[PDB]
Amino acid sequence: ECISVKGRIYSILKQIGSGGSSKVFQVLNEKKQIYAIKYVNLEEADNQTLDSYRNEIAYLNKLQQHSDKIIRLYDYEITDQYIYMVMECGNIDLNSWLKKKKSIDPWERKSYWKNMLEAVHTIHQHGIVHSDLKPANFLIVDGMLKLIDFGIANQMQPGTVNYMPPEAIKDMSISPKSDVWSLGCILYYMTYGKTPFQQIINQISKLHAIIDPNHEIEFPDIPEKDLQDVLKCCLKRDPKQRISIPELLAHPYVQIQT
Numbered sequence: 449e450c451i452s453v454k455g456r457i458y459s460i461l462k463q464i465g466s467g468g469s470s471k472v473f474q475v476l477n478e479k480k481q482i483y484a485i486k487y488v489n490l491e492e493a494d495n496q497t498l499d500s501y502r503n504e505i506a507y508l509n510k511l512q513q514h515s516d517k518i519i520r521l522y523d524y525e526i527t528d529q530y531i532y533m534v535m536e537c538g539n540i541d542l543n544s545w546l547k548k549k550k551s552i553d554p555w556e557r558k559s560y561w562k563n564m565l566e567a568v569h570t571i572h573q574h575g576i577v578h579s580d581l582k583p584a585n586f587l588i589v590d591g592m593l594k595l596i597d598f599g600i601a602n603q604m605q606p607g608t609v610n611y612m613p614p615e616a617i618k619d620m621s622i623s624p625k626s627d628v629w630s631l632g633c634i635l636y637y638m639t640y641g642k643t644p645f646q647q648i649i650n651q652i653s654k655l656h657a658i659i660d661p662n663h664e665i666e667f668p669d670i671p672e673k674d675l676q677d678v679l680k681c682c683l684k685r686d687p688k689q690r691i692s693i694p695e696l697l698a699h700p701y702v703q704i705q706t
């Protein structure tokens with residue numbers, strides 16, 4: 449019914465998501481303004497997963513000043529029992545938006561890709577690599593994409609291996625380039641309606657398909673030949689050959705309108 453956070457009451461409307469021991473609510477303040485509270489339950493959690501949330505919050509704070517493409521954290525309260533994070537509510541997560549609309553607008557797609565690049569770039573500058581970027585990681589706030597988390601704390605549902613970079617699958621016997629791949633897979637979805645490996649059902653085969661160069665990824669021709677080069681370059685299996693964020697920010701597809 450009600451939640452306190454640093455001397456401010458918040459009335460719960462609905463629940464949006466749930467995870468290991470966390471919940472994301474949609475709440476109203478006294479002035480009937482809409483927000484989102486991330487609630488975490490610490491009473492049950494390991495010591496190596498308590499400090500994940502500590503890092504998550506610390507970095508979420510650190511990075512407010514540095515970009516408006518990072519989700520806004522208004523205020524937070526943290527004990528040994530719980531965590532409350534007052535954040536933006538927004539309209540919809542990107543994962544739930546790729547499932548709703550079938551035909552994606554080119555102008556809107558570019559705009560989102562810009563946001564994504566900016567947000568990821570910003571975190572890359574402060575030495576963080578979100579080694580697990582999904583569309584679930586982005587929120588829409590009035591036609592503007594915003595990054596929700598840095599993939600330090602555990603992910604929530606309202607789990608796929610699609611966006612996983614080859615080098616990560618190879619790391620069984622991190623680089624900023626790993627996020628470029630994941631971003632590649634996410635822009636692919638926004639272009640060809642699916643991820644570059646969505647059709648493959650078996651997991652051990654799909655992982656092999658990820659690392660196997662002899663598996664060639666299809667790039668069907670598009671009116672935007674610029675978008676095609678981006679993904680092409682984002683999905684290079686060699687992280688040394690893959691395109692960087694700063695290169696992508698200097699790319700025709702981001703910097704030039706039709």
Ligand SMILES: COCCNC(=O)/C=C/c1ccc(Nc2cc(N)c(C#N)c(N[C@]34C[C@H]5C[C@H](C[C@H](C5)C3)C4)n2)cc1OCC#N
Nearest residue numbers: 464465472484486535536537538539540541584604605606
């Ligand atoms: C079974 O049906 C449940 C789905 N309910 C909905 O209608 C919500 C979609 C939604 C989804 C997210 C959202 N905004 C936010 C705002 C935030 N500040 C955070 C955080 N942290 C967040 N995180 C999640 C919550 C759920 C689990 C995951 C993925 C996604 C849904 C976004 C993290 N989402 C606002 C949203 O819009 C609310 C409305 N109407």
